[PDB]
Design a binder for this molecule. Structure first.
Ligand SMILES: Cc1cc2nc3c(=O)[nH]c(=O)nc-3n(C[C@H](O)[C@H](O)[C@H](O)COP(=O)(O)O)c2cc1C
Ligand SMILES: Cc1cc2nc3c(=O)[nH]c(=O)nc-3n(C[C@H](O)[C@H](O)[C@H](O)COP(=O)(O)O)c2cc1C
Ligand code: NA
Ligand code: NA
Ligand code: NA
Ligand code: NA
Lengths: 386, 386
């Protein structure tokens, strides 16, 4: 089974992604990874040599074994003592201001619950791993998944921003793959010019007020065959798996498949996607279901929406308690941006790609790309022969 | 690790739930299971001896091994040939009208994608397993989880209905455990009398029009300790795990933790739950996060909302294709109700309970309830001693 794991602290030496269970023969390079990492940095309101492929790829082709990708920390020299792996003289450490105690947990962040859970008197060990810097390692892994999906299935994954702050949501038609350059060129990764202007204005107002914004993003996967995922149990359903992968992204508080919560307000006669005869099989005129029925891909674009909360580190830090003393306090000062919704969209693409690649390998099997491709072709033919 | 699996076809001999990895010493009986199964049948707009505990429980106490619970099918005699496990003479079968071909997949259901996936020319094998009858087996498993949560942690799980059809959503405060009798006595399992009347009216109108409705439900878990789930990776986050467990319920198209999509429309200064000193530790005046931060329980009520689509089997069957011929068709006639939202709420409680019980055993360990309880107490004391 395809599996992915990330490791690293935000201010540690490096991040590492490991992908296991990918077939041999998938073309992917350090440049591909760097390109996707650059996309994760996109957005209004927020070193390529830092990527090193350590294992599992040779001459731009996957080997079949575990793929380990390292992302170096360019500011490691500042953190090499505070985040040293090995012991440091506590006296030396005591003189380092940067090592000062972090005992005022931020509302909305992992700090408080993680400190209690792990018995830590300091937030440092929690925030270092909880930080969304970890999504960089996710994107490295996702690049391997996305290469596989393209090469094996002709599938493309993209995202666009639906709303930021109080903007009027974009409810027009979703983009296609050919639209991604324009989307990534938008300061807010919008597919609609009116929505773009509205969102930029919301960010400007928040920026002036010293506040932060969340938003809603939609990931779209195009070209999927029918029958990835299964109805046979809750955990094998693709909607279940996608919901896990997307809700587990930092700051995501909501996930929808297709029209989601709006579907719940509709009558059955107007809520589903009717089927009609077509040249090359069944066709539909709507995609309210977002490309999934009974936990399976149904031929239509997959559409997954995610709601991101506004960043919790607000420049003037919110009210909290100093756990050292029990006193009222203002929260620890940390990384804050006005809005990270466009980047959150890119992270959603990655998690969607990983889950789709896993599901594809489950159905089509194979140990090399050519093998998997033969199996895909035979299945497609069998469906066509219906 | 706590694991659950369901087995059975809707019209097969019986359903089976198996729960593995539950500690010994949890008090649970066949009557408890039957009671929860009865709750799953609640709701306007839709045999206890049928429950048999086969293994893993002795004299009302779990043994520590796998717990297998059987739910018999009272109409098995009608289906004993059509759904026979063993071969039947095809000539005999050919004379049975009930065995007629089902080749007109229902929009919105598993039929089409499942038929293509598995290479079936008939929807019968798909709909039999995809059917929400399977949620009965889930509820049997969930009963074991819910007993554990109560006995080990003093935790209660309940649900109420927020909206059905075009009703004005209930946005008042959530219920407590003591409110469940009143909720379960409501025809639509509402906690608010105005919302109740509104929802009942929506159902009446849909029923008259021969249409179906979906809705939104909220599950609440009370009494949870801080620090279940973890921030250490996406898959260990409780929000991820809950999203998987809830989205994998038949007809769920959206999941929120706390204020969800509405949170995405708020400014950071008004989106999070500030912390204040209190007698027995940190207290909060809001629970916008729904009891989770950084993938961990944070002391506040857990709140999970789920959007259920209107049932897809509409009495006058929607437009589809007959896969046998390629012709336009009306969809296969099957079980339809006007609204199953109240029952969907009960199913959400079960999936929440299962995930919470698993997370609790991950942190607190133990092989018997008394052992787990000692470990819980020691952790609580260590937190108090802060
Ligand atoms: C791309 C990305 C960037 C983020 N940047 C920040 C940030 O700069 N400051 C912050 O407080 N939270 C940021 N977050 C969110 C926190 O990491 C997150 O809220 C925290 O780990 C608690 O997890 P939860 O919000 O999922 O409960 C970011 C999230 C993502 C997806
Ligand atoms: C309690 C419960 C009862 C349901 N009853 C029906 C029903 O009677 N008829 C129907 O078409 N769908 C019913 N459903 C929904 C279908 O099982 C579901 O839409 C189908 O398996 C396709 O899965 P998906 O909607 O998750 O894509 C019910 C769901 C639940 C939770
Ligand atoms: Na679409
Ligand atoms: Na190959
Ligand atoms: Na609450
Ligand atoms: Na015991």
């Amino acid at each position: 089974m395809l599996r992915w794991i990330t490791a690293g602290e935000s201010h540690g030496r490096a991040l590492v992604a490991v992908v296991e269970g990918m077939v041999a023969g998938v073309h992917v390079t350090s440049a591909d990874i760097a390109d996707q990492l650059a996309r994760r940095r996109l957005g209004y309101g927020r070193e390529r040599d830092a990527v090193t492929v350590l294992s599992g790829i040779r001459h731009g082709s996957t080997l079949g074994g575990p793929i380990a990708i390292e992302i170096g920390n360019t500011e490691w020299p500042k953190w090499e003592t505070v985040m040293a792996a090995d012991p440091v003289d506590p006296a030396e450490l005591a003189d380092v201001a940067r090592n000062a105690p972090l005992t005022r947990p931020r509302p909305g962040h992992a700090d408080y619950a993680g400190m209690l859970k792990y018995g830590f008197d300091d937030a440092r060990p929690v925030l270092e791993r909880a930080s969304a810097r970890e999504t960089a390692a996710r994107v490295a892994a996702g690049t391997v998944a996305r290469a596989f999906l393209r090469q094996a299935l002709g599938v493309e994954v993209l995202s666009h921003v639906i709303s930021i702050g109080a903007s009027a949501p974009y409810e027009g038609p979703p983009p296609r793959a050919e639209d991604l350059p324009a989307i990534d060129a938008s300061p807010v990764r919008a597919y609609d010019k009116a929505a773009e202007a509205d969102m930029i204005a919301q960010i400007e107002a928040a920026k002036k007020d010293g506040d932060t914004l969340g938003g809603v993003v939609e990931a779209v996967a195009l070209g999927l065959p029918v029958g990835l995922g299964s109805f046979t149990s809750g955990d094998h359903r693709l909607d279940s798996q996608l919901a896990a992968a997307v809700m587990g992204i930092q700051a995501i508080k909501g996930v929808e498949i297709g029209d989601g919560f709006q579907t719940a307000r509709r009558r059955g006669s107007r809520a589903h996607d009717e089927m009609y005869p077509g040249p090359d099989g069944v066709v539909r005129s709507t995609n309210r279901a977002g490309g999934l029925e009974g936990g399976m891909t149904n031929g239509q674009p997959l559409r997954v929406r995610a709601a991101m909360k506004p960043i919790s580190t607000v420049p003037r830090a919110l009210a909290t308690v100093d756990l050292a003393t029990g006193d009222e306090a203002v929260a620890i000062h940390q990384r804050s941006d006005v809005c990270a919704v466009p980047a959150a969209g890119v992270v959603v693409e990655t998690m969607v790609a990983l889950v789709l690649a896993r599901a594809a390998l489950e159905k089509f099997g194979g140990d090399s790309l050519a093998e998997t491709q033969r199996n895909i072709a035979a299945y497609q033919r069998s469906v066509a022969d219906r």
